[PDB]
Ligand binder design. Structure first.
Ligand SMILES: O=c1nc[nH]c2c1ncn2[C@H]1C[C@H](O)[C@@H](COP(=O)(O)OP(=O)(O)OP(=O)(O)O)O1
Ligand SMILES: NC(=O)c1cccnc1
Ligand SMILES: NC(=O)c1cccnc1
Ligand SMILES: NC(=O)c1cccnc1
Ligand SMILES: NC(=O)c1cccnc1
Ligand SMILES: NC(=O)c1cccnc1
Ligand SMILES: NC(=O)c1cccnc1
Ligand SMILES: [Zn+2]
Lengths: 277, 180, 277, 277, 277, 277, 277
């Protein structure tokens, strides 16, 4: 009911040599850089507001606690971006990034499009470390700006720290992305029409990501394809610790789960990215 | 309507705190059942008891947990006093050697408003009785004799017990810090 | 920062005598009828699937655990509706409903529209107990069906048990309502343009309810009203146990919180509905 | 106020050598193949229905007269597709297509994406004539189907005759495309975020094409770019006979008009496509 | 014609013990923290634009070269603030700041108001290092925000990096401050009515600072005070390398020059701040 | 819509214990000292000019009738200041000032700044009666003069009788203060950035006071704060007899009205100043 | 990115025949009369003060070195005006002015308003040479003085040598003009509301000229005109040697650059003024 690493490796080679495999990188991909995930941010927002971090967690979800933070005082969200810039893109996080085996194995492949939902320059920065060049696309001005001819386009799906208007963190910013009208939303839905995705270090907790894969099946089911042909183009979900409910929800959306070895999280991902080559 | 709620399932603790803090119209009463963590430290258990009782009732809550640290048992039970009196009822007077009967009766209030947990701790020196005596009160009151006094908590009335027990100093500290 | 019962009572009389107050009833309004809330359903779905009810709860949210239930076997959702009908609308739940002080105090007022998100005939059934007559509107055929002239229209916002196609319980049914295209969605957004609502027994946990109040502020903020005039039409949220984060999120959406006495939940609601008269 | 051919030629070379120019081909591009435009179809639908072709034209617009045709009898739209297939893709239209100077000049360039709104295999067929290979993408199954690595993708925006469910001709099919949810709609809106377009043989009469360029400016104006930077990425509209109103409407949408010589329509287009090389 | 360190020391003790001495700190005060001054920023802006740093310097003044940078591309100024935040407020600039003798000698005195024109948290950060607490005031929301009772207010006169809308760097932002209507402008002009200032590490090159001291003399000369009484309240300008023209311009504005020893710039400033105590 | 005395008393205690409350005293504060208000001056100017006091009032406003008085003859304004000195600061007005309950309740609080718009030494004289010491600041030479360390600064906003050049009474002197360039104007606009004010005995009839609160909202509205945060810092307007129009004009400018009991004007003010303590 | 002479010639004819073109003449317009520019004055001020002219230049800007000159001794500025009058308006500068092709081509056109920033009678003197008559307006008494009916008004924007109080040369005189309250300032800002200007021989180095064009865009941007209509009324900047930064700064202010041939400066200007006719 779940692919292993050796089973999923010839399936990922076929989609990569055809140029139809696109990585989707989450907050767990920057975990070996000693960065906060979605839980250590809330522990830092609770310290500023005067909450204990265990009491602040039980008043709402991740989107709702950041919405409460941003309206506590004026200019409270601007300060968070400034602080995150200092801690996510610091020089010691740069130094952990050249010697990271996941970021080396990611940049060794010749991708054309990479999607990320984390606010740090460590996915395009991994491509600059390997001598390659990348193109960060986050806002409308980036898509219409000049690029080079054949350069890997890194789509910052949730925003970048150097453009603080593009960061979606609060609940009102997730509701603004439910219209699927932002330039990262329109680019994602067109790439999903034709490409397989590889989710690495990401857990489907964002209700706007799950809503995009929902509405691709409304195109898939209305097109009245067979049992054989509607199940042909799959997406892949590499996860150490998926539960018992979530892999069966995603089978509806043509998403297969690749079970990685949970003893060493960083080496299991790196062996997956080296098996694509 | 009340603004603070004292949560206990023990109906004998309820009539003690209503004997002194009863006329305060800002204090309500709830009866949610929580599960304590396994630790002998009173400060650790009462702090994890308020986060587990705020999760149940979702209002500003006040919880209470005690300790009966004994010198002959190197501090045991501590905050593990609830399963000792269940297991050793009055044999607890017999498992302790005669001559080193000294013990501390500790007690702690912790109020949680949803953002902060503040712990108030009082403490009474004493010694375990040679045998259980007295009828009043409740759990382990026939075995504890405070320092200076000859009688137990069970032998004294509710006005006289609260002039020795840790709760009689915790009424005034809870009333002042909360404005009850 | 939070209205009491005596403070909110003249504010609710003014909107009721103008005919611009509409109740919105949740799952906590049927709690004195000894019915399951959103947690005792999941305890019943876990028993059918072979889970322990505490282990089944930590694999996903309420929408996602019901999505996992409905795809476990064919016709598994149809059986749930049948079981819910026998339990929610049973004869002993009818007998607890005439002697309930909340349902008597609700039906004593002369409402014109009532919205509910629960699957039971105990809101329109409370109106039949008081000699009044109601009109259940759940699907497209109900809105175009014949009614009488001046009859309280009960809008089953999440569906009814006698029309099992209208029940939204699983995650895919909540995503289908994100388009705001269903007939209860279109009727709600037009009533929200002109009326104050009174949320009784409901907690804002549905991301499609929160998204409707989100997009009413996008009309409110784009209309460029003043500080005084954009804050004039309020909605009211009666809740015994609102936390510390959620009342400040809803102040953005012109929703005021009415703090009820949590010692007796049923009598606190009944005194609120009697203060409107 | 309008570019000439020699003025627009260095502007089209710059966007083509960067790989950011995409042709958009209309019904006037298949006019030298002796095919009907949008007016000779209506003259053929009026003959079947028993109308005089001048009396049938004054009862509605092009979308509405085809909607009236399709509901006159059962299977009346299926017959039209069959008749169009025999007339549009006939062997004598193939023979006029190798010796057409526009189709030779189009296929001489190394495009990557071509959009068309006409129902004929004469744009991808022009690429097969030059030894190149093309990939027709019209439905959801085409986007998820297998292609080769670097092949010009011809996006049949309004459908293809070999897939009759994809043809949008009637008014109800244009209203179904107003949701911008079809796979050619989602691919167009993502390519418009990053690329210049060249409209050849197309007149903006489709209210779903004009609505896509409308909503790209709602992204452009909300992004609050300057006067200089919001006017940088232009689109180009080659037309022999644009009026006096329509070029000023399209200046709002960053669409520049290239005035071609109206004496010989086919040679003016061919000199434009040869100036890009 | 110029005060020495021992001559100016009893003049600074008298104004400090009366509470009427306010420091004004410039870009040279953060020079021992290895930060750029106004010339190494332009060397960094020229590298991004593709200029040689010596050729870029001769096309305009400091305000005008930053105006040219900010309009070269969209979001070009936002990136600069992000880069400056990671370079100015880095952890190695924090570590040089505790062992800096100027920042220790500044925080040893019990000031009430400090003005700075540099974008770094190293003046209020020096007060946090000495156990004291500071209050950064940069925007309108900071002045109306809550502070403590007796806390040194650090007025970021040109803006702060955690509030990027307050940074005045380009020429258009200096012209916007010529109206003297910003909250740091209004607070400065009222403190100048009653207090002596001490300029440390600042050179009068900003035409809005010089315009404020200009218009204080228009109040001083119109009030028709004597020769003795109009020259009583002085300001002090500590500078290692003032030229031959600028000290005589500032004598008009009651600004006296304190000549510091130019052999060691950091130790000369530290002996001045220790002589006030 | 209007605060009472008991409602506004905890709001004034909070701003006073933080040191952010500043009294603003008008001509009605010196009414129990049997002094003229703005109407009995005009009755005295009409007697000198040979007018009947009811006929002189209907030829212009208060500013314009004093402008007509000052240009009737040479040295006519100097005589008025001399006459006012004899009647406002007389010894019998001193004797009514120690036994006045408002002036005792004002001096019992430990203020730091007091603004007045009346020409009499009865606000700083009330502080000398309570053993405290005050510092009158009216002109440019007063702001740069020597004071003590922690002494309540009484800002004579419209001038003092011992400095007759500072008195603004005529229309030309109000127009000279529209530039907001005087030293009391610059000190007021900087204190308004950070402090709540308490208007006692003053009615907003001066068009230069209303223009200062106008331009503080132009800073407040351009800073784009929320509905919650732009309404946080309020000012207070204690008045026995405010009409129906003026309290709603001042709600725009964050000025709340405190309704005092109009039966006894002196005792209502004294109970307000005693409730702050 | 820069107009040539033949491109800008039909744009200048259209504004001239409508009477909406006004010349703005700088110090480079009097360069063929062998007069000092802004650099040879400073070489003459350095000789009087005892400086070497290369050492005097590096102590401040042009405004600041003249401020240092004027306060070196009493009556030092008046002597400079007397010397300038003897050198600038000498008889041999008159004789070079009739045979100058720029001054003949300027006076051949029928202007109505001419602005100059140089202190010499060679712009109105050029009009007297062509038989026309001019009206010099420099001070308040000139604007209210008598003129004839239709006579070209020459606005001496920085002053005239026959009225030495109007000359702005020192830094304190430029700061006095920042209020934009002088009669040449008020006349310029009203002519800029309705007219195109032609800058000939002037380089934007005066911070009060740049501040006037700054604040015309604050009217232009607040009026919320479109992209098309806010860019309609242009100003023109004829310059042989504009750099790389300054033409892009002035595009913000609707100022277009006309590149003249730098080989012969006098003949390039004369061909521009003859192309307007
Ligand atoms: O001052 C006291 N005087 C006499 N006996 C006491 C006292 N304080 C606690 N005790 C007893 C009661 C219980 O047997 C055990 C504490 O365990 P404890 O968890 O707090 O009791 P509980 O669970 O039944 O009620 P609750 O819900 O308030 O925790 O020691
Ligand atoms: N940049 C990150 O690693 C990150 C972590 C958590 C949330 N968003 C971003
Ligand atoms: N009918 C109900 O009471 C109910 C409860 C919980 C969820 N859905 C419906
Ligand atoms: N295939 C075509 O040329 C065509 C013409 C008119 C309308 N649709 C298609
Ligand atoms: N804060 C700084 O170091 C700085 C440097 C240069 C210009 N502005 C600020
Ligand atoms: N000093 C006063 O009472 C007064 C009265 C009227 C006007 N100005 C001052
Ligand atoms: N009169 C002039 O030409 C002139 C020259 C230099 C500076 N100012 C004026
Ligand atoms: Zn317990």
């Amino acid at each position: 009911t779940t692919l292993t690493l050796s089973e999923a490796a010839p399936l990922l080679k076929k989609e990569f040599r055809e140029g139809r495999l696109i990585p989707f990188l989450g907050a767990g991909f920057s975990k070996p850089l000693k960065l906060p995930d979605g839980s250590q941010l809330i522990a830092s927002l609770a310290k500023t507001l005067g909450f204990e971090p265990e009491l602040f967690d039980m008043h709402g979800r991740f989107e709702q606690l950041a919405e409460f933070f941003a309206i506590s005082a004026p200019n409270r969200l601007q300060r968070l971006v400034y602080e995150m810039s200092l801690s996510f893109d610091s020089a010691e996080a740069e130094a952990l990034r050249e010697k990271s085996p996941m970021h080396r194995a990611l940049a060794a492949l010749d991708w054309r499009t990479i999607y990320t939902t984390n606010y740090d320059k460590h996915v395009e920065g991994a491509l600059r470390d390997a001598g390659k060049q990348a193109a960060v696309l986050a806002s409308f001005a980036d898509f219409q700006g000049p690029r080079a001819r054949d350069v890997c386009e890194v789509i910052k799906f949730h925003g970048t720290l150097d453009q603080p208007d593009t960061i979606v963190l609060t609940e009102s910013s997730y509701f603004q992305r439910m219209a699927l009208d932002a330039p990262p939303d329109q680019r994602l839905r067109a790439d999903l029409l034709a490409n397989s995705f590889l989710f690495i270090g990401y857990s489907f907790s964002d209700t706007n990501i799950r809503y995009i894969w929902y509405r691709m099946n409304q195109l898939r089911e209305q097109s009245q394809l067979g049992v054989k042909h509607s199940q042909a183009r799959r997406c892949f979900f590499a996860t150490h610790g998926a539960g018992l409910v979530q892999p069966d929800i995603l089978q509806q959306w043509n998403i297969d789960v690749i079970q990685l070895d949970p003893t060493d999280k960083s080496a299991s991902v790196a062996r997956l990215l080296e098996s694509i080559a | 309507a009340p603004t603070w709620f004292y949560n206990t399932t023990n109906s004998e603790k309820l009539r003690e705190l209503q004997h002194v803090l009863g006329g305060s119209a800002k204090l309500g009463y709830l009866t949610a059942k929580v599960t304590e963590i396994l630790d002998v430290d009173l400060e650790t258990v009462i702090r994890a008891k308020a986060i587990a009782a705020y999760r149940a009732v979702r209002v500003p809550v006040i919880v209470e947990h005690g300790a009966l640290c004994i010198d002959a048992l190197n501090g045991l039970p501590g905050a593990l006093v609830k399963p000792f009196w269940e297991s050793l009822d009055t044999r607890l007077c017999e498992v302790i050697p005669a001559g080193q009967r000294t013990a501390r009766a500790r007690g702690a209030l912790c109020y949680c408003d949803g953002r902060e947990r503040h712990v108030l701790i009082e403490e009474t020196e004493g010694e375990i009785a040679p045998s259980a005596r007295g009828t009043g009160g409740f759990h382990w009151d026939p075995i504890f004799i405070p320092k200076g006094q000859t009688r137990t908590f069970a032998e004294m009335s509710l006005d006289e017990k609260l002039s020795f027990s840790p709760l009689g100093r915790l009424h005034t500290r809870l009333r002042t810090e909360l404005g009850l």
